[PDB]
């Protein structure tokens, strides 16, 4: 029913103290962790992971609570879905594989896990790539009318439960397809492999999966913001070499010029626009893959 | 089935070029137009309108597209649900009753119609009361993280059709009750007459009515903002004596001191907080009715 989009990749259930992380694992060479975002799963990497697997051991993980990874129980402060907790859990998952120093590329929510990981435990990362995000602090700080309309879901999904859970349940298939379509350049689903969309749709069909996504956005509005705020105020920069990729019509370039923003957050950051909407690895897999392989090889 | 909450009030279907306005009509004396907002209907005035009917000809109108008023078909610019168009339609409606000069009190969306009416056609108004709002421009201009979370529905309901409509359609009862409860001081529905809630619920149960509400919010995000922006940047002030009432726990006071804001928009404005959430005429009817009687009688 659900297609295997990573031929030659194994499937691993990585145990952590907070639950299992699901990951497809392929290739050999230095470890490279790939983190998806919302409303996707690891399969969003299916077009770039094979090219990366030529040079790296590629670990394509479902974020905690996403896809087939376990859903740790949340609490009053959405703690397990804060990027800090997710980062700690993925660090632990990587340690189960013996990877204590690895390359990391994240898109959307996974890119927020990624830069928070880079801020909290920089020694874990050889190089970091973030796809089509600015730091969470920067999105909220740039909140204005235009941005509020563009990323309305940042405030919608952060509403107290069960408000977004109830509404998302009103038409989950429409919602996930609408989010996928509206953030591509084309404005429809033609950029996606339909087997990939089926993965995203099935994940989104689970009410517990949707609640987790809301918890993630709740963390995004609260604890994630405060964690970012601490770093901004302390002048903490990401010391890892990092690559910022954004879509020419993605979400990140809607708020500011992404490289200028990331230079305030990272001491060694390169960046390039990709002719694409938000979903760089699916809308522009070749340009995304090439930029990633070049950066992660140096 | 729906209760008559205005014993002794007439019922009128006022024809306008944009469709029929429904209104309850009671009392005698100077004409006083009362405009509800979202997600309510004219019945929200059922506790204060009898007090006002002792001294005024009270016209308790459903907004264009709301309640029992006709729903003009919208367009790509949400024109009929812009506050400018709504104001024009209500001017037409009042003219059908022979009221070319009248007092006006609006709450929520109806308050936005009201101040826009006062800016576009101040000669139509003897006095103006706005209940628990700031100008649409000011909400958007003050859109930061905290406020984007508080009034997320401003950006959510402004999302392109059919996204909000599809989400609202899964369980419309939940949403209307959630919004009613969440903006009251108590955070539940105890402030409302259950017969009134039934009116609100039944109106919200109609997908066309929900569409209109989203159109109203889309206008609120685009053309309404643009019209306000023109006025504020041109320094155009409301010249009609006006009363700004707001709930101490309401929406307007959340991101600004309401009277300071209104003093920028109106040359002759007095204000008073009322111990209440957003729904002043139902949460604090006596206090609201007294403030309005005192103001419109002076």
Residue numbers in the entry:
A (entry chain B), B (entry chain A): 3 to 300
The authors write:
Here, we describe a high-throughput approach to serial oscillation crystallography. Using the silicon microchip technology with fast translation that has proven to be useful for serial collection of still data from crystals at XFELs and synchrotrons, we have found that adding oscillation to crystal data collection dramatically decreases the number of crystals needed to generate a complete dataset, compared with still data collection. The high-throughput, fixed-target serial oscillation crystallography method described here is a practical, fast and economical means to collect high-quality room-temperature diffraction data with minimized background scattering.
To demonstrate this, data were collected on chips containing FAcD with two different oscillation angles: 1° (Chip 1) and 3° (Chip 2). A complete FAcD dataset required the collection of data from >10 000 crystals, with at least 3318 images used in the final refinement; in this study, with 1° oscillation, we collected 2626 datasets and only 494 were used in the final refinement. On average, 1° of exposure at 10° s−1 led to ∼70 kGy of dose per crystal.
